[PDB]
């Protein structure tokens, strides 16, 4: 286990725009060893990558192609972390 | 089940090549109503699409980036059809 020791936060968990990279961070320092899985589900395909953060958290960026409501899940050892899944409204680009 | 009335078959359930569209067909005619889910899981990102085939089956094409073994899932109403997941060895071109 250890999912309860993981926290995720950032703009990409609150709102996104179609085609614009949406970014958030995952606090992993306390969780120990395990599989950290990020998933995006919704009306269009998503591309997800892991990134560096200065603060030592694990950075995530994703891009979706169409507006709509998407669900972003973050699981650790196949267990939802607190507040996952996140419902993220994705708007047409401004 | 209902997923037990679904069948899938084609080169893309047997073997694939990185960068090369891998194709198979799903016979859906007698599962009735429901959600047909195809998934590709493995060492790189997969692009997946559907085509309505002229023979009346549901066509599927996928492309993956890297060689390795991939699991191709075909589920009907969250249940694996017979022989799913398909383990597909993927060669480099």
């Amino acid at each position: 286990g250890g999912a309860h020791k993981v926290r995720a936060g950032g703009p990409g968990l609150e709102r996104a725009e179609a085609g614009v990279p949406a970014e958030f961070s995952i606090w992993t320092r306390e969780a120990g060893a395990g599989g950290l899985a990020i998933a995006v589900e919704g009306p269009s395909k998503a591309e997800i990558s892991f990134e560096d953060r200065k603060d030592g958290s694990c950075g995530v960026a994703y891009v979706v192609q169409e507006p709509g409501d998407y669900e972003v899940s973050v699981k650790f050892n196949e267990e939802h972390i607190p507040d996952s899944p996140f419902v993220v409204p994705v708007a047409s680009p401004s | 089940g209902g997923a037990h009335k679904v069948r899938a078959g084609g080169p893309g359930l047997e073997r694939a090549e990185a960068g090369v569209p891998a194709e198979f067909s799903i016979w859906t005619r007698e599962a009735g109503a429901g959600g047909l889910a195809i998934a590709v899981e493995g060492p790189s990102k997969a692009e997946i699409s559907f085509e309505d085939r002229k023979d009346g089956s549901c066509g599927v094409a996928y492309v993956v980036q890297e060689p390795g073994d991939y699991e191709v899932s075909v589920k009907f109403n969250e249940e694996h059809i017979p022989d799913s997941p398909f383990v597909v060895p993927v060669a480099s071109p």
């Binding site: - | 889910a37 195809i38 590709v40 899981e41 997969a46 549901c58 899932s73």
Partner: peptide, 13 residues
């Protein structure tokens, strides 16, 4: 990393 892509369509007679 392990990657998964999935696509779900609704079948309706």
């Amino acid at each position: 990393p392990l990657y998964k892509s999935a696509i779900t369509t609704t079948i309706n007679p």
